[PDB]
Amino acid sequence: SPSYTVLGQLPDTDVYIDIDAYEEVKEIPGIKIFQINAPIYYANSDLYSSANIHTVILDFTQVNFMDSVGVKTLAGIVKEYGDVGIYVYLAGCSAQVVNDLTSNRFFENPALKELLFHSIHDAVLGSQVREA
């Protein structure tokens, strides 16, 4: 899909890249890592289309800002996975993106600040142990 890319881990490293870019790159069981490549309502439309995972990690490294519609869309993804016990983490948001999330009430509940990680690897380590 052009709107997201599934990422895997280069074995025994903290490097995460397109699963199809290199043969030995491998997804981590229990985690889905998607890099956002277009505004989130495109990826969200893909999500709806295909619809044992404990965590979904969204890599925001390509995202430069978010609009109000995008924030509402993301808040619904996080809510709906959370309602079945699956955490959605946001990896690599810039300070501007977090400002946009904040302005659009994504953190009305401050607990949602615990979904932010600087890197994909930090989010993978953060998924190991947490309130179930």
Side-chain angles (χ1 to χ4, degrees), residues 57-72:
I57 299 172
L58 301 184
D59 164 21
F60 277 68
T61 62
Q62 302 200 337
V63 180
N64 295 306
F65 70 82
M66 303 180 56
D67 58 38
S68 298
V69 174
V71 178
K72 182 188 99 59

Side-chain angles (χ1 to χ4, degrees), residues 1-7 17-20 33-37:
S1 173
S3 73
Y4 72 90
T5 304
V6 174
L7 310 182
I17 57 172
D18 184 343
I19 188 58
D20 293 324
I33 303 170
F34 301 121
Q35 180 180 74
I36 298 176
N37 303 127

Side-chain angles (χ1 to χ4, degrees), residues 63-123:
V63 180
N64 295 306
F65 70 82
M66 303 180 56
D67 58 38
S68 298
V69 174
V71 178
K72 182 188 99 59
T73 296
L74 184 65
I77 293 166
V78 167
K79 184 181 174 300
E80 299 173 16
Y81 275 118
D83 285 342
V84 298
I86 295 172
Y87 281 71
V88 174
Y89 288 163
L90 314 184
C93 299
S94 67
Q96 181 66 56
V97 164
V98 172
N99 286 346
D100 296 337
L101 285 171
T102 297
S103 305
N104 288 109
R105 299 189 176 280
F106 188 80
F107 305 105
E108 193 72 0
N109 181 354
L112 272 72
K113 293 187 276 167
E114 302 170 24
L115 301 178
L116 294 175
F117 290 88
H118 176 59
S119 65
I120 293 162
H121 199 64
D122 292 334

